[PDB]
């Protein structure tokens, strides 16, 4: 009925706001990025600090893992993305092309491609092996807040302060669908459901929405949290109960029942905006991370 997530670890070490936390696909590691220009790797189950990955000249907005858990990509205000070999910590490639801060990034499931979103209003698709830009999509008319590939990499979904959610054919770059409600508040997040049939989208009117984009219809609305200013990451949690999980600008992690939309738990502990949450791929484990009055990551664990 309800989870019972309890605090297990507080991961200290970043010196500015944390921007993003992500579990490796094999579940072994958490990676974190921060305004302090650094990536940090931590053990997912014992919270143990592993190493620092350095090289960006300005703060990092996002980090993402390849499917084999061997590479990371980061997006930075220095207008580049970097591909990192996690074991060595070396920068394998620097991805130049964006004309302003890069804000979001992701590998596709095969992990031969990376997608980025930028303040320059564009979405780019990059070849992992060469570090070259394959396509620049004129995706939006304001900064792009999130980019995500669907389950097999055949589609990209993007969101922008322009109020729109768009879905793109990866191979061609053709826009297959624009989602818009009668109202156009800035869309601060978007991602595909694990089965790729639905889309979870956050807008800066304190609202999360689950969209059936085959039919272009909003099915669920989740409220009660605070989200009017920041681009906060949300997630589907599928390892036990089927929940929706998001950060909030009242320093809490919110957890909703996906089907009934009822708030099932609120996680208190952070002392600043909870900007990012990640759900563990196999265990009922949540990582949360907060802005610069806090600077820590928290690992939580529930029985369902």
From Swiss-Prot:
Q: Tell me, how does this one assemble? A: Interacts with PAXBP1; the interaction is direct and links a WDR5-containing histone methyltransferase complex to PAX7 and PAX3. Interacts with HCFC1. Component of the ATAC complex, a complex with histone acetyltransferase activity on histones H3 and H4. Component of the SET1 complex, at least composed of the catalytic subunit (SETD1A or SETD1B), WDR5, WDR82, RBBP5, ASH2L/ASH2, CXXC1/CFP1, HCFC1 and DPY30. Core component of several methyltransferase-containing complexes including MLL1/MLL, MLL2/3 (also named ASCOM complex) and MLL4/WBP7.
Q: Name one GO cellular component term.
A: MLL1/2 complex
**Matching InterPro entries, A to Z?**
G-protein_beta_WD-40_rep, WD40/YVTN_repeat-like_dom_sf, WD40_repeat_CS, WD40_repeat_dom_sf, WD40_rpt
Consequence the record notes for mutating residue 291 to A? Abolishes histone H3 binding
Which residues, renumbered to this chain, carry the PTM N6-acetyllysine?
82
| Principal subcellular localisation of the protein | nucleus
The effect of residue 17 to E is:
Strongly reduced affinity for histone H3
Subcellular localization is given as: Nucleus
Q: Which Pfam families match?
A: Beta-prop_WDR5
Site Important for interaction with histone H3: list residues: 77, 103, 233, 292
Q: What is the effect of changing residue 233 to A?
A: Strongly reduced affinity for histone H3. Significant decrease in interaction with KMT2A
Kindly state a single biological-process term from the GO annotations of this entry: skeletal system development
In the UniProt annotation, what is the result of changing residue 61 to F?
Answer: Strongly reduced affinity for histone H3
Q: Which UniProt keywords apply?
A: Acetylation, Chromatin regulator, Host-virus interaction, Isopeptide bond, Nucleus, Repeat, Transcription, Transcription regulation, Ubl conjugation, WD repeat
Which family is it part of?
Answer: Belongs to the WD repeat WDR5/wds family.
Q: What GO MF terms are annotated?
A: histone binding; histone H3K4 methyltransferase activity; histone H3K4me1 reader activity; histone H3Q5ser reader activity
- What are the WD repeat spans here? 13-52, 55-96, 98-138, 139-178, 182-223, 226-266, 269-303
| Crosslinked positions (Glycyl lysine isopeptide (Lys-Gly) (interchain with G-Cter in SUMO2)) | 16
| Function text | Contributes to histone modification. May position the N-terminus of histone H3 for efficient trimethylation at 'Lys-4'. As part of the MLL1/MLL complex it is involved in methylation and dimethylation at 'Lys-4' of histone H3. H3 'Lys-4' methylation represents a specific tag for epigenetic transcriptional activation. As part of the NSL complex it may be involved in acetylation of nucleosomal histone H4 on several lysine residues. May regulate osteoblasts differentiation.
Q: What is this protein called?
A: WD repeat-containing protein 5
Q: What, per the annotation, is the impact of changing residue 292 to A?
A: Strongly reduced affinity for histone H3. No effect on interaction with KMT2A
């Amino acid at each position: 009925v309800k989870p019972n997530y309890a605090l297990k670890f507080t991961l200290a070490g970043h010196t500015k706001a944390v921007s993003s936390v992500k579990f490796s696909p094999n579940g072994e590691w958490l990676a974190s990025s921060s305004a302090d220009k650094l990536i940090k790797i931590w053990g997912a189950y014992d919270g143990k600090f592993e190493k620092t990955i350095s090289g960006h000249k300005l703060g990092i907005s996002d980090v993402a893992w390849s499917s084999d858990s061997n590479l990371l990509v980061s997006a930075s205000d220095d207008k580049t993305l970097k591909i990192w070999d996690v074991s060595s910590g070396k920068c394998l490639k620097t991805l130049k092309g964006h004309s302003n801060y890069v804000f979001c990034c992701n590998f596709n499931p095969q992990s031969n491609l990376i997608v980025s979103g930028s303040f320059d209003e564009s979405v780019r698709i990059w070849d992992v092996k060469t570090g070259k830009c394959l396509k620049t999509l004129p995706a939006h008319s304001d900064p792009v807040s999130a980019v995500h590939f669907n389950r097999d990499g055949s589609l990209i979904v993007s969101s922008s302060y322009d109020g729109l959610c768009r879905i793109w054919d990866t191979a061609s770059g053709q826009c297959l669908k624009t989602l818009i409600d009668d109202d156009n508040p800035p869309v601060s997040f978007v991602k595909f459901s694990p089965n790729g049939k639905y889309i979870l989208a956050a807008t800066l009117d304190n609202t999360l929405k689950l969209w059936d984009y085959s039919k272009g219809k909003c099915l669920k609305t989740y409220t009660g949290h605070k989200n009017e200013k920041y681009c906060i990451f949300a997630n589907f949690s599928v390892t036990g109960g089927k929940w929706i999980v998001s950060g909030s600008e009242d320093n809490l992690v919110y957890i909703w029942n996906l089907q009934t939309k009822e708030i099932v738990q609120k996680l208190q502990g952070h002392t600043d905006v909870v900007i990012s949450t990640a759900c563990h791929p196999t265990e009922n484990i949540i990582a949360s991370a907060a802005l610069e009055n806090d600077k820590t990551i928290k690992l939580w664990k529930s029985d369902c």
